[PDB]
Amino acid sequence: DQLTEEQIAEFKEAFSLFDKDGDGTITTKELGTVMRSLGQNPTEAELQDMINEVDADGDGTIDFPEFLTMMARKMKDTDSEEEIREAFRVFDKDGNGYISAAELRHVMTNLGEKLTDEEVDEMIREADIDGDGQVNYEEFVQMMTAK
Ligand SMILES: [Ca+2]
Ligand SMILES: [Ca+2]
Ligand SMILES: [Ca+2]
Ligand SMILES: [La+3]
Known part of the structure; x- marks a missing residue:
């Protein structure tokens, strides 16, 4: 309401x-x-x-x-535990625990939005807390709870 x-x-x-x-x-x-x-x-x-x-x-x-x-x-009922891990596997295909700019851009392109490589790297750094240039599952859920 x-x-x-x-x-x-x-x-x-x-x-x-x-x-x-x-x-x-x-x-x-x-x-x-x-x-x-x-x-x-x-x-x-x-x-x-x-x-x-x-x-x-x-x-x-x-x-x-x-x-x-x-x-x-x-997005407003389900997805809390053992459900976010499934979504993480969609981006991180090789399952190395880190989502690179190439993996994120690949999934977005499949959705329909063919963003530029530079734009995707800007998103990665945004959720990148340890500064390794990638987004692990811990940072994934952290950005998923924020805007
Ligand atoms: Ca990877
Ligand atoms: Ca139609
Ligand atoms: Ca990271
Ligand atoms: La209808």
Whole structure:
């Protein structure tokens, strides 16, 4: 019961990356494309269940308001313990305990945002507390709790 301007901004950014055609609806093809690039393999039946969960009007696809609710369930309900480690493994593929600028940029590119290499290195230094030029799991959760 509030809804901030920053909140809507975060959702809108994610929604634009999902909807490749920007028609306002997310099909199983679009939803599956994002998850497939994140190192996951969800089937047609699996992707459909995700859409039906937030299907307010039951049109078969994910609309703008339906997507807002979907993100509110994961980013504002779940993800506390044994769930952040799974997300960390998505960025750090080799699992060395450190997320380099190359790994972060790779995941972002798969999402849809093809940022520059220099921009990603600026993000790394932001979460870099020990000054090693990388982001470990300890620094990952630290930045995940902050803006
Ligand atoms: Ca679409
Ligand atoms: Ca690594
Ligand atoms: Ca570090
Ligand atoms: La819908």
